[PDB]
Structures are given as structure tokens and as C-alpha cells.
Amino acid sequence: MISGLSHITLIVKDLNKTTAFLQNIFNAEEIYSSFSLSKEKFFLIAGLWICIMEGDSLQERTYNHIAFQIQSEEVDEYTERIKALGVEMKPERPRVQGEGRSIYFYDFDNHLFELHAGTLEERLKRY
């Protein structure tokens, strides 16, 4: 069986610019930096290992994405933080009852990120 999540790998055209992005918004803690076969850095974000690699590859924008957990009270604060950095944010997404609030925004390489204030239990409860 699967032990769990190992890490998430994102390819970006500008590693230093993305690094700043992650450190500002996610309080990402760099724990590794690339003789290396590629320019990459590993960050620890809320217990999750995120690997960023510099490269030309660019995935078209889609709803395939990662969602991090935040508390309801923090929605406005993160909204202000994203707004401050001029990063593109999505408008309010339609929701069903039991589905908590979320914020959606992009990095500089078509990666959509979600900050979700809801829970799985609430979602399944009504269900």
C-alpha cells in the first residue's frame, strides 16, 4: 500500500522568482538547494515537501490543483496577502451547502493554488 504523500514537483521558468513567491505567501522554508543535474530547490510548506525545478515546460491552465488548509478566520488575511503581491486571483467559485470557503490564485507558471477553509467531514455530512 501507499505510505502517503512523498512530495509535489513543480516546474517553473524562473526559480528565484518562484522561490520568493513561495516564501512570501506560504512561509515556505527552503531545506535544500542544488554538482547538480538540474536547478532545483526543496521547500517545506505546512509539513509538505515541495520540489521546484527550473525548466521550459509549461502546462496549460486547468483545475488540476493542490489545495492547502487554512482556517475560516484567515480567508481575508490571505486575500490581502495575495492582493499585495499582485498575483492573479480567481473570483468566488459557486459552492454547495457544506462546502467551505476557498481562495484561488496562480503562481508565475500556470500553477493554480487553493486555500480551503472547509472540511471533508462537513462536506460528507450532508451528503
Next chain:
Amino acid sequence: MISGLSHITLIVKDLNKTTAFLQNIFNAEEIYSSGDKTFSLSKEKFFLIAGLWICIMEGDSLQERTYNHIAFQIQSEEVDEYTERIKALGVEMKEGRSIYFYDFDNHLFELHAGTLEERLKR
């Protein structure tokens, strides 16, 4: 501050085919299903894989393959086992430490043997 991972959302063309893929390889447990084509409401399912909430929504597959991907952890002793199990599904694969393969929607997945924590020793 961000307390951790909430969930991972993937878009796939065939939800029933993907569900089989998830259950077979990752021992994914379906815990939720919604959708009503007569109500113009697309299909969506929730699965639990090693305690992780995975949301799957039916839609378009990724247009091209890129190195952006998710990596799940397994045991080193399990590398050969998972290699063969993946092969049995006909999906394309790119006893070491990492297995790379795609599902039917151009999503690159990685099965990593060992912990990145231990990986740090370059």
C-alpha cells in the same frame, strides 16, 4: 497559518476508468460520488489514499505531458511489486528508488522509495 494539505484535485476524461486505476494501484477508497448529467452537473468523486483526500472531476485530459507531478511514498522493498502492478494496466512508464508513470489523462505520477528526509545527503 496554513495548517497542512486539504486535498488534491485531478481532472479526468473518464471517471469510471480513472476510479478503477486509483483503486487498483493506490488502493484508493471511494468515499463520495456526485453528478447528474440530466441536471447538467458534471461527475465528481472523492477518494482516500493513505489518508489523503483526492478529488476527481470529469473533464478534459491534460493536453501535453510535463514533469509537474505528484509523488507518493512506498517502501524500497515494494519497488519491483509496484513496477509489475503498473505494467498490468497498460499505462506508459518512464528495484531502484522511483517509478514514473502516466494515467489515461497525461498526469505524471511518481512512486518514491525512501523519504526525502533521508534523501538529503548529496
